[PDB]
């Protein structure tokens, strides 16, 4: 039951849901990230507590609730009135909505915080998973000190408005959220690399950033020009501040943190189109702000400049391989017309994504793998090459390790009469065609798959020609082979006897026949 | 016929006709990119549909159809008044000349979906080309339901004014026509590998990007001004912007169009020398376009700094190397005579681009192109040595892929009287001369294509001297000889033992001669 499933429960990290669910976390970590700040800067954005009162000329001049026609073109800021209860029946409605996404943020803490409780570890390349063991692990860690701190519910008694004692509230009592971020950076690192863009995804992932750096940064400059007073000089928000309020615009909720989000990008991107300073308190912190806003617009031009450079790298390396043959082909005098081979064949094989190398599997993966995926590609084929066919398994995996690739391109001879022949032909991705002594006939067409040259790679010791090719086989399009060498054969074939002396069986009743 | 040609044609990708083909569906591309939302936005673009009236003053103040001194110094803006027939009697030729040119890029679109129907693929290395082939690979792929979206002829019945139903045109339905976009990727992608300075012809279309993009944004800008109102606000074109219409400025489509990319240039370069926004929705856009300005000025900022980089990366390498060096030979206390000799060598390398290697042909290359490229250079050459005169081309071709380049500098010698002699030297871009014992006398003297050394690089055993060099050799200038070895020679020669017996012939004969 549900007693029984959750005392089991351990987590396994790898998961995909667990992936989801750090993904869960993330969302809960940037509501707080947002709205934590905004609701202590940004006060009505749970409703007013106090009750805006303009000084209007009727008869005579005396102080009424504001509308929205008297703080439109405003010779003077208003002043403000706490209700008795601040504001809590005009706007309990906003203030629950407030309180039931802090209550669900929470419980997503909770929840994250027994998933940490129950969280399998490696040991020994194995993922542990017994739940002894895992809370066991979890309270040597000290992961419970930041799980705790992270949920202390503070900002429940102490930041909300509380009418009894005219207690205002501290919504920045919940910034102790913010310890779990190592969460957040563990979902960032596992989307960039479940993703199909990552070089895209990181420079995302640092414009997402600055954008939260421009929206603290907004609730820092209201704060401030708050605390200095609002319309007391040209530089705060507020009447004198002419590109704040302008001719026939309202001061609202809305506007100031409009405002404050325009003055924030302005100051941070070094565009500085904003009013200048007035006293030494708002110099030294444009000054600060200015400097910071430069280096932020270094980081997102550094960011940029080094996606630009990771996806042009290939490009790069290829025109400076094209660059160098040419280079050569000039110094050492060759044909224009070998030239324009040379450039059509390096061409192609940029257009088509080939490479020239088995090197991208053989160094980077472990020699399991590469056996692996060399008997996934060559065994099948090796398997029916018809000497190969009464051998054992270890032969075969030895050899398909042993495969070179040799491309030709239309028209090309692999071989011609009389040629010295030390090597077998596998035709993959491609056609080759046997052609009479003067490259206008056909006796055989050869298709992917195929095996030419199997005799030649024995050692027959008197076979009627047995070193000198007796064929001419040039290639239709662009081709494809795979050789295995005499010498490679001979080599790996010294380690099985048995296998050894049974090829040479075969070999001679081929020949004979 | 043509009923037979047009039947039986099949389209091969690869051409140079069909590279400008894909030069041609580009201009059609870039016309539509442009002329669609430029005829969306500014409508007069067609001729007006509508008369311009001005409030004028004359005895008394009436409504009166705007001339150029109406719309200069404005006071408000004009208000419109539609023609019974939208236009089309005044601007019927402005109109036909739009139509002419929209069925002319829409003919180049229906030629190259006959083309894409038509078209040749690559198959096992050759490209296909079988009428039937090529139509069945274009149904089993879904190119005709990219061909056939972006040629709906939607604009032609409702893109133009139809005075009779009152429909004013809705020019943004030709949009469809930008669905087309892989041809053009196709038609830049090649134009970068055929250029000549492939560095310069991507920030070159980076460019070419941002004026689009720059284009697109003016559009947008004045959208969003004509929707908010002509000369509401110190923002929006008008009269209210007094850089939009300064004092002695008229109100004409082409100051429209000539602010508007103004302000886009201004803001997408992040330099912001434009009005202030006045409302939210103001604030909200321009804060987006700044924000995709920054993003922009990192992108062009990117690009020119990655080509910089790649323009100077071969003088890096070699400066690095030249560091090296002389960090060495400070290190290890080398004198100031032979340091500055290294540096001339190393200087002389650099100025002539030498780069002392052949593996820029080695690695990159396939070996059917490397053992071409070797024959052409080589093989005539080593075919006058007057030992290898009478041999087979077999092992004449497996020896030039067996040389080694060794550059002298001026004055060097290569041999000295009573030295190891285990080499063959083919002199190339340069001049030997043998001097006698003290290097003030001249026997004969070496120029390009001649060989020294070939009789000991044989094995006479017992002729006289057979090891030691017995000669002089010195370099006039920058010599660049080439070197077949002992060691390679008698590898290549165990594989022709018929071309060995009849080496070591030869060389009794010359010897005893
Ligand atoms: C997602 C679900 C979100 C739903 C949003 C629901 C309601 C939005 C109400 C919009 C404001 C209505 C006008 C109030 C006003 O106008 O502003 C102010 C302040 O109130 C507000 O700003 C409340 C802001 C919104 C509070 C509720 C938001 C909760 C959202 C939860 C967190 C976000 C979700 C994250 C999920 C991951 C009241 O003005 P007053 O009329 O009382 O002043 C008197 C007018 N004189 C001057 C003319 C007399
Ligand atoms: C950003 C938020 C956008 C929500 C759209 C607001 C609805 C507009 C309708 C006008 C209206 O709701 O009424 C507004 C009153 O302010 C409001 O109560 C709307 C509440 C919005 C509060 C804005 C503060 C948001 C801070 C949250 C932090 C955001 C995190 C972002 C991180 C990058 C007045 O309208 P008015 O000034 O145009 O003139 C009227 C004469
Ligand atoms: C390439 C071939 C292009 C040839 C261009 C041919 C003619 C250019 C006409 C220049 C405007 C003449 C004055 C009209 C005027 O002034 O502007 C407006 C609007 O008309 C225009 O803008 C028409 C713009 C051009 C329409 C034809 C362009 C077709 C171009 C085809 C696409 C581009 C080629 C792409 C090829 C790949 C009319 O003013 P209104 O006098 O009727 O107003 C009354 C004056 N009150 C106020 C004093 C009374
Ligand atoms: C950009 C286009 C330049 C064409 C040059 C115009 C001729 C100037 C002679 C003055 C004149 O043609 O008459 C103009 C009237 O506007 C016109 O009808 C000219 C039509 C030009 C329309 C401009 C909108 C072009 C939008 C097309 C998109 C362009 C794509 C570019 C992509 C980067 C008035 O002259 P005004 O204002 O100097 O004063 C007179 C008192
Ligand atoms: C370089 C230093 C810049 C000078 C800054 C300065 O003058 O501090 C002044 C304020 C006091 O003045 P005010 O803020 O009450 O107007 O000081 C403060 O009240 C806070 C100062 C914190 C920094
Ligand atoms: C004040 C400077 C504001 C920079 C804030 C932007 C930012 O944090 O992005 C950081 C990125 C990469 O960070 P990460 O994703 O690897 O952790 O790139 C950087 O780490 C650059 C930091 C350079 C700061 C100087
Ligand atoms: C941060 C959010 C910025 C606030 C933007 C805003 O206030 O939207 C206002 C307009 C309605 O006003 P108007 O455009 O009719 O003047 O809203 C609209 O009509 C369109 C809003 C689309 C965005
Ligand atoms: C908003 C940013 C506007 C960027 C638009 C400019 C642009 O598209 O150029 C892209 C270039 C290279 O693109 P491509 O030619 O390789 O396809 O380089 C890039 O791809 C850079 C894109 C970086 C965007 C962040
Ligand atoms: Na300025």
């Given at each position: 039951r549900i007693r029984k499933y959750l005392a089991n429960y351990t987590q396994d990290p790898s998961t995909d849901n667990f992936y989801y669910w750090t993904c869960v976390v993330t969302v809960a970590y940037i509501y707080n990230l947002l709205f934590v700040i905004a609701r202590q800067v940004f006060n009505d954005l749970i409703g007013p507590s106090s009750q805006s009162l303009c000084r209007f000329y009727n008869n005579s001049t005396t102080?009424?609730?504001?509308?929205?026609?008297?703080?439109?073109?405003?010779?003077?800021?208003?002043?403000?009135?706490?209700?008795?209860?601040?504001?809590?029946?005009?706007?309990?409605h906003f203030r629950m909505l407030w309180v039931f996404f802090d209550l669900l943020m929470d419980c997503v803490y909770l929840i994250d915080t027994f998933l940490n409780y129950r969280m399998g570890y490696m040991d020994q390349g194995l993922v542990v998973?017994?739940?002894?063991?895992?809370?066991?692990?979890?309270?040597?860690?000290?992961?419970?000190?930041?799980?705790?701190?992270?949920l202390i519910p503070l900002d429940y008694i102490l930041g909300w408005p509380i009418?009894?004692?005219?207690?205002?509230?501290?919504?920045?009592?919940?910034?102790?959220?913010?310890?779990?971020?190592?969460?957040?950076?563990?979902?960032?690192?596992?989307?960039?690399?479940?993703?199909?863009?990552?070089?895209?995804?990181?420079?995302?992932?640092?414009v997402w950033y600055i954008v939260i750096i421009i929206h603290w940064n907004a609730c820092l400059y209201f704060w401030i020009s708050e605390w200095i007073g609002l319309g007391t000089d040209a530089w705060v928000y507020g009447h004198l501040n002419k590109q704040s309020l302008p001719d026939d615009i309202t001061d609202t909720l809305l506007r100031r943190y409009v405002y404050s989000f325009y003055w924030s990008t302005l100051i941070l991107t070094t565009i500085g189109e904003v009013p200048s300073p007035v006293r030494n308190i708002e110099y030294a912190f444009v000054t600060l702000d200015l400097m910071c806003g430069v280096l932020i617009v270094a980081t997102i031009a550094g960011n940029v400049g080094?996606?630009?450079?990771?996806?042009?790298?290939?490009?790069?390396?290829?025109?400076n391989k094209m660059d160098?043959?040419?280079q050569y082909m000039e110094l050492r005098?060759?044909?224009?017309?070998?030239?324009?081979?040379?450039?059509?064949?390096?061409?192609?094989?940029?257009?088509?994504?080939?490479?020239?190398?088995?090197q991208q599997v053989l160094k980077v993966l472990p020699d399991k793998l590469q056996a692996e995926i060399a008997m996934q590609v060559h065994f099948e084929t090796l398997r029916k090459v018809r000497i190969f066919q009464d051998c054992e398994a270890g032969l075969l995996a030895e050899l398909v390790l042993?495969?070179?690739?040799?491309?030709?391109?239309?028209?090309?001879?692999?071989?011609?009469?009389?040629?010295?022949?030390?090597?077998?032909?596998?035709?993959?991705?491609?056609?080759?065609?046997?052609?009479?002594?003067?490259?206008?006939?056909?006796?055989?067409?050869?298709?992917?798959?195929?095996?030419?040259?199997?005799?030649?790679?024995?050692?027959?010791?008197?076979?009627?020609?047995?070193?000198?090719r007796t064929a001419n086989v040039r290639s239709v399009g662009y081709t494809d082979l795979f050789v295995l060498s005499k010498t490679d054969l001979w080599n790996a074939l010294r380690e099985y006897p048995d296998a050894r002396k049974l090829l040479l069986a075969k070999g001679r009743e081929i020949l004979k026949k």
């Open positions: 102080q009424v609730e504001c509308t929205y026609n008297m703080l439109t073109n405003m010779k003077e800021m208003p002043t403000y009135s706490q209700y008795p209860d601040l504001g809590w029946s005009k706007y309990w998973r017994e739940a002894e063991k895992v809370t066991k692990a979890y309270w040597q860690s000290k992961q419970y000190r930041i799980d705790g701190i992270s009418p009894y004692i005219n207690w205002r509230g501290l919504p920045i009592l919940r910034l102790n959220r913010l310890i779990r971020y190592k969460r957040v950076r563990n979902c960032l690192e596992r989307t960039e690399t479940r993703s199909s863009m990552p070089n895209a995804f990181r420079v995302v992932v640092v080094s996606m630009i450079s990771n996806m042009s790298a290939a490009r790069t390396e290829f025109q160098g043959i040419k005098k060759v044909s224009k017309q070998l030239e324009i081979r040379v450039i059509k064949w390096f061409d192609y094989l940029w257009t088509n994504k080939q490479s020239l190398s088995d042993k495969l070179q690739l040799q491309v030709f391109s239309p028209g090309d001879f692999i071989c011609k009469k009389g040629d010295i022949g030390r090597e077998m032909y596998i035709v993959k991705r491609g056609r080759l065609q046997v052609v009479d002594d003067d490259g206008k006939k056909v006796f055989v067409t050869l298709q992917e798959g195929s095996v030419f040259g199997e005799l030649s790679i024995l050692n027959i010791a008197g076979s009627k020609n047995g070193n000198r």
